[PDB]
């Protein structure tokens, strides 16, 4: 079952890396930043797959596709993983 984890970026962004999109295999949390919005939410961990950002689907998304979406997701980023 997926989660609706709402974040807010700081001078560190959302606080997590991503990998995948490199072939339609999807995007996965690659690492959590200590102190970051991700970390503090304790609702996302290394390994989680990003299904969508602010209602926008990222299952088939490419890397840069997820990268950019996340990047301009606003200040109130609604993540589904």
């Amino acid at each position: 079952e997926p989660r609706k984890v709402v974040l807010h970026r700081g001078s560190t962004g959302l606080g997590f890396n991503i990998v995948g999109g490199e072939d339609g295999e999807g995007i996965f949390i690659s690492f959590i930043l200590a102190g970051g919005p991700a970390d503090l939410s304790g609702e996302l961990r290394k390994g989680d797959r990003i299904i969508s950002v602010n209602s926008v689907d990222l299952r088939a998304a490419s890397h840069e596709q997820a990268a950019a979406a996340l990047k301009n997701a606003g200040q109130a980023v609604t993540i589904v993983a």
Binding site: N17, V19, G21, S30, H63, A67
Partner: peptide
Amino acid sequence: RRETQV
């Protein structure tokens, strides 16, 4: 090997 921080 692409990995991005966000």
